[PDB]
Structure 1
Amino acid sequence: NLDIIGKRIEKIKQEHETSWHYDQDHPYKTWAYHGSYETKSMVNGVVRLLTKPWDIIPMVTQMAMTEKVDTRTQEPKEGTKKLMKITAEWLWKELGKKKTPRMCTREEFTRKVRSNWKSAREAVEDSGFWELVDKERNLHLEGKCETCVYNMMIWYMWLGARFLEFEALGFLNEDHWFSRENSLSGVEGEGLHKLGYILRDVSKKEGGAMYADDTAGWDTRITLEDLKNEEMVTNHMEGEHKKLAEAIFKLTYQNKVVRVQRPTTVMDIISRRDQRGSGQVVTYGLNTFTNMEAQLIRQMEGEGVFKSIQHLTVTEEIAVKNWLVRVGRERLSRMAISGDDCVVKPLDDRFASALTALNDMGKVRKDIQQWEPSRGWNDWTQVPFCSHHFHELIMKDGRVLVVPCRNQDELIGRARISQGAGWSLRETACLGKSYAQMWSLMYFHRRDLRLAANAICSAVPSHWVPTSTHEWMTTEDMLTVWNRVWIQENPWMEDKTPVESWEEIPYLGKREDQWCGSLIGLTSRATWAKNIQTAINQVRSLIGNEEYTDYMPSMKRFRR
């Protein structure tokens, strides 16, 4: 405990010796309190002016306006712990069959920060920072830590600590350990234009309903035995790397020090050995891994591989092992897993009431009573995954698009928001164009979004570059990007005949469009569409005398 966190806690106190108070009214129960010290959503006008009908839709307008953590997690039973240890060991070996753990480099880290001290870019160019890094590094090589502290305001750490995390664990993301080709259940690097096709291929598999249970506060349900099963990745490493990775796991993940803003204003220095604490990218990879593990074990319970989680017999151990060796890869292929998010098509519907292992691992389902069986989906096109559902859409030439979709109020509401301020008009315009190009590539099938996207791309200078997969982040023609993404590079499309205009590219049915939140039918929407050139001209007049393209004639109704 304090042997590992003391040094860090001692350093912060000395740096604040003129304010160190052991507040006795601290509100912490599950987090260890060590001491305390003294401390102290913007609208995108370009998108909003070109989406006037949505100015009166509360779902859109309210998006721009504005205890689970402090909880414990019962230690799993012995049988649960063994199932998780056996499953983790087997899974790291499978992920490692065609991959080589390796250190990520100051070079790789520098290039990344220079493509998204005052900013981190300045520090990456300052040798003093790398000297501070080297000090902590050599410390980590000793099994000690000084500066690796979680800074809340999602816990931000100091860039150097982030570098050490990347150096030791960045390979999981950088080398695509959770790609579908390597993990079978994963979807890292796939893209929204591929997720629907993946869910459709899972559907193809003989089995029961498709289950998509969300966990309540997954990061808060991350146990120590979870963190120890994740650390077994180090048993595939060698030399300095092994030691470095081991230090990240022991000193920064399995023992954490955090600084929390408390108004009553003071900063509190609290610690904890349990819960997800790491970079949002390492967090994603380890969430995927431990979710894959949990869902394989839930599949084991459904299929009758183990009778009880209280304790595992030796025969039950060999059975779990033979199951993993005989059908584990097939079982992973029945899943789509993105961090804490999952879709499982099990062998049959016994999975729906196989809840003992899942509840005992602490991965308790959200919005359903603890022992109530899961409600599965009979149609892959209604399954939720990564905040979307997926439609099957037949082109006038009989080729099949599987397209991503969500409630259109959510799409329009997000595009109306800019994060951080100090934005020039030009930068606000380039963010608006990023959303419009995304809509043209992923949501072309929604009448209002194709129209609003064309309007935004007409109102913003043709050569301005979209700012902040993301194949929509380019100045290339959007039709040529469409063709590359949906035809040329689409492994589900046998016929590679390119599309010659936007009018070849279909929409959802009018009623389906309305069901997913379209405003077609409304007189507000009809007036908006009819007079769109006037809205386009309002924004052109604000930006000024620049080179503009009219993209509206790409649509049949404006092709006049």
Structure 2
Amino acid sequence: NLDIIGKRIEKIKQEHETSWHYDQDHPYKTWAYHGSYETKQTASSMVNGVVRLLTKPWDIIPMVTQMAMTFKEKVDTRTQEPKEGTKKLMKITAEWLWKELGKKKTPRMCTREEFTRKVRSNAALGAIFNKWKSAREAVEDSGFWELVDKERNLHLEGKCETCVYNMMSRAIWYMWLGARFLEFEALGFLNEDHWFSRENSLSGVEGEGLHKLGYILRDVSKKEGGAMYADDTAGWDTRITLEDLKNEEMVTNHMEGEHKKLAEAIFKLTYQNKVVRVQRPTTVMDIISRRDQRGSGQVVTYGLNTFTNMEAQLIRQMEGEGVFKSIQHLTVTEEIAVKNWLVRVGRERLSRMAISGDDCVVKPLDDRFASALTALNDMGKVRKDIQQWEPSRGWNDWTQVPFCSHHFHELIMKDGRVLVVPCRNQDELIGRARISQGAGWSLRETACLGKSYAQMWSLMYFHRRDLRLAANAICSAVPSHWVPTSRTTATHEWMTTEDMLTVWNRVWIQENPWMEDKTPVESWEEIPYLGKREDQWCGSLIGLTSRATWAKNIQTAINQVRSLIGNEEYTDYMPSMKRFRR
């Protein structure tokens, strides 16, 4: 308690000595409260006019238009301590999983150099407004690094002064850049060196890309076993126990020198003890602490979520296979059975899973998995939208399985080759493309964001008739040489000025390990769509009068946007589709 977080508390207390009160009508039950001080401020979703003007039929579809308008009583809940058999199952499994992830990887510090390059090409690292404006400025100034150095030597001493969270089913915890560097220096290796790649971790998909996830699910489908299970957890980040955070910290056992001490300090001082500053309307800043739940950078969060999800799902598999009999207590021969299962079949069992952070698909040995719920519930990984002891509903067809907000279609090209393509409800795709985040967008920047969506659609969703047509219209309405942009950057092969047919060929043919024949495609008309009825099922407007008028008059919509942007160089991409090819 206060010995580890006090220094951090004491510091904030002083900087607002003119305000510090122990407010008595404070909400917190599960968060420890420490005091308050005065503040006053709040970023809503702006519409991308370039995409909206070229998607007129969707102006009257509430599922699209409502997306652009507009649970902190789940962050204030508590998770019971797992039983002794559960804690033992997790410790054995975690120990074994780090060893296997570590067999072909070397833990190592990430550097100021690596950190700087990242800031100067815009990843959502999560810093704050103050002393320097943007992160881009602080990185170049030696002052910052002296701040970073003071804290760094403090961490080597087992103490912390400035590593404090800022709160804001979502709750994103920004830290100041300095503390972000210290987290990256010690744990960035997990992402930077691809510890959760499929090749390295067998269950993971880190770095895979949407054009790969469908093929991966189809490979899992080829295994002998039962249904495919894809149970979502209710508020995964809020269900991370202190026992979870202690099995995650066992990565430090693989480390040495400085690194081991620095990683140990991140885990002890910022993860297993946390200090947060929260905005309350009634408006003050609340300085609250707690030991458990997830609160890291979004990138370290992703890797430790994948690790702990891999661990949970191996254990649920162990329960289905009857490797242990009860979570109350493991016997001595049960420990040696668990260790032996891991050594004998652990890698084969990892390969039966696709795990992206809190998101999973498992193809277990058989359907005993569906009612193997005691360890899963006792670890606190409670399933969403199903009663706690009701057996899981599995999927019989890999093409029906939800994973990473998608499902996947099998699509045969007129030449017999097989594409496995990502898909989701088309209203969700159009609704998201019509939205921009943040202020001070020029017409040119708005156009270049619309071009990023259009190029993603040509690469990932070319099989949806409305999206191929709308993608061609947007790429026709935006100047040919203007570069696609995004403000929060998987693979992103659509972010380029290269010809989209050439990028399609590289992604889907040349570099696709599931495609044996490397014959390039010479036009978009060789590239197939879903069946007309399947396209409607997945939200296509084909068949509606609104959509026919839109398609027929598309050059008038393109010309409206060209007139707004002004006399620039434009390409007509509509003749890439047969109906506009005369």
* TM-score bucket (shorter structure): over 0.9
Q: CA deviation at 1:39?
A: 0.7
After superposition, the C-alpha distances for 1:174-231 in whole angstroms (9 at most, x for unaligned) are: 0000000000000000000000000000000000000000000000000000000000
Q: CA deviation at 1:151?
A: 1.1
Q: CA deviation at 1:329?
A: 0.1
Q: CA deviation at 1:421?
A: 1.3
Q: CA deviation at 1:328?
A: 0.2
State the distance in 1 between where 2:292 and 2:250 align. 17
State the distance in 2 between where 1:37 and 1:31 align. 18
State the distance in 1 between where 2:442 and 2:214 align. 37
State the distance in 1 between where 2:498 and 2:78 align. 51
Q: CA deviation at 1:168?
A: 0.1
- Secondary structure in 1 aligned to 2:36? strand
Q: CA deviation at 1:423?
A: 0.1
State the distance in 1 between where 2:447 and 2:110 align. 36
What is the aligned length?
Answer: 560
After superposition, the C-alpha distances for 1:273-325 in whole angstroms (9 at most, x for unaligned) are: 01001000000000000000000000000001000000000000000000000
After superposition, the C-alpha distances for 1:491-538 in whole angstroms (9 at most, x for unaligned) are: 000000000000000000000000000000000000000000000000
- Secondary structure in 2 aligned to 1:134? helix
State the distance in 1 between where 2:332 and 2:411 align. 51
State the distance in 2 between where 1:490 and 1:419 align. 33
Pick aligned residue for 2:571 from 543, 549, 557: 549
Q: CA deviation at 1:445?
A: 0.1
Give RMSD over aligned pairs.
0.9
- Secondary structure in 2 aligned to 1:145? coil
Q: CA deviation at 1:483?
A: 0.1
Q: CA deviation at 1:366?
A: 0.2
What does 1:46-65 correspond to in 2, within 5 Å?
46-65=50-69
After superposition, the C-alpha distances for 1:44-94 in whole angstroms (9 at most, x for unaligned) are: 000000000000000000000011110110000000000000000000000
State the distance in 1 between where 2:109 and 2:512 align. 33
State the distance in 1 between where 2:406 and 2:167 align. 30
Q: CA deviation at 1:458?
A: 0.0
Q: CA deviation at 1:131?
A: 0.5
State the distance in 1 between where 2:76 and 2:110 align. 34
- Secondary structure in 2 aligned to 1:37? coil
State the distance in 1 between where 2:192 and 2:437 align. 26
State the distance in 2 between where 1:121 and 1:103 align. 22
After superposition, the C-alpha distances for 1:343-371 in whole angstroms (9 at most, x for unaligned) are: 00000000000000000000000000000
State the distance in 2 between where 1:61 and 1:549 align. 29
State the distance in 2 between where 1:197 and 1:149 align. 42
After superposition, the C-alpha distances for 1:22-56 in whole angstroms (9 at most, x for unaligned) are: 00000000000011111110000000000000000
After superposition, the C-alpha distances for 1:137-196 in whole angstroms (9 at most, x for unaligned) are: 000000000000001230100000000000000000000000000000000000000000
- Secondary structure in 1 aligned to 2:285? strand
State the distance in 2 between where 1:17 and 1:73 align. 35
Larger deviation, residues 525-534 vs 146-155: 146-155
State the distance in 2 between where 1:494 and 1:131 align. 55
State the distance in 2 between where 1:419 and 1:504 align. 36
State the distance in 1 between where 2:376 and 2:462 align. 39
What does residue 420 of structure 1 align with? Answer: 438
What does 1:201-350 correspond to in 2, within 5 Å?
201-350=219-368
After superposition, the C-alpha distances for 1:245-291 in whole angstroms (9 at most, x for unaligned) are: 00000000000000000010000000000100100000000000000
- Secondary structure in 2 aligned to 1:75? coil
State the distance in 1 between where 2:109 and 2:470 align. 45
> What residue ranges of structure 2 are gaps of 5+ in the alignment?
122-130
State the distance in 1 between where 2:159 and 2:513 align. 49
After superposition, the C-alpha distances for 1:114-150 in whole angstroms (9 at most, x for unaligned) are: 0090000100001100000000000000000000000
State the distance in 2 between where 1:254 and 1:432 align. 42
TM score, norm. by length of structure 2:
0.96
State the distance in 2 between where 1:274 and 1:247 align. 16
After superposition, the C-alpha distances for 1:443-468 in whole angstroms (9 at most, x for unaligned) are: 00000000000000000000000000
- Secondary structure in 1 aligned to 2:431? helix
State the distance in 2 between where 1:187 and 1:412 align. 26
State the distance in 2 between where 1:305 and 1:475 align. 54
State the distance in 2 between where 1:422 and 1:15 align. 32
Runs of 4+ in 1 over 6 A off after TM superposition: none
What does residue 126 of structure 2 align with? Answer: none
State the distance in 2 between where 1:161 and 1:439 align. 37
After superposition, the C-alpha distances for 1:413-470 in whole angstroms (9 at most, x for unaligned) are: 0000001010000000000000000000000000000000000000000000000010
State the distance in 1 between where 2:347 and 2:207 align. 20
Q: CA deviation at 1:20?
A: 0.3
Paired-residue identity, %: 100
State the distance in 1 between where 2:226 and 2:167 align. 43
Q: CA deviation at 1:473?
A: 0.1
What does 1:22-171 correspond to in 2, within 5 Å?
22-40=22-40, 41-66=45-70, 67-115=73-121, 117-153=132-168, 154-171=172-189
- Secondary structure in 2 aligned to 1:63? helix
Q: CA deviation at 1:332?
A: 0.1
- Secondary structure in 2 aligned to 1:336? strand
State the distance in 2 between where 1:382 and 1:128 align. 54
State the distance in 1 between where 2:316 and 2:568 align. 59
Q: CA deviation at 1:240?
A: 0.3
State the distance in 1 between where 2:346 and 2:104 align. 17
TM score, norm. by length of structure 1:
1.00
State the distance in 2 between where 1:293 and 1:470 align. 29
- Secondary structure in 1 aligned to 2:340? helix
- Secondary structure in 2 aligned to 1:258? strand
- Secondary structure in 1 aligned to 2:68? coil
State the distance in 1 between where 2:291 and 2:36 align. 20
State the distance in 1 between where 2:31 and 2:142 align. 36
- Secondary structure in 1 aligned to 2:292? coil
State the distance in 1 between where 2:344 and 2:196 align. 21
What does residue 446 of structure 1 align with? Answer: 464
What does residue 489 of structure 1 align with? Answer: 511
Larger deviation, residues 144-153 vs 343-352: 144-153
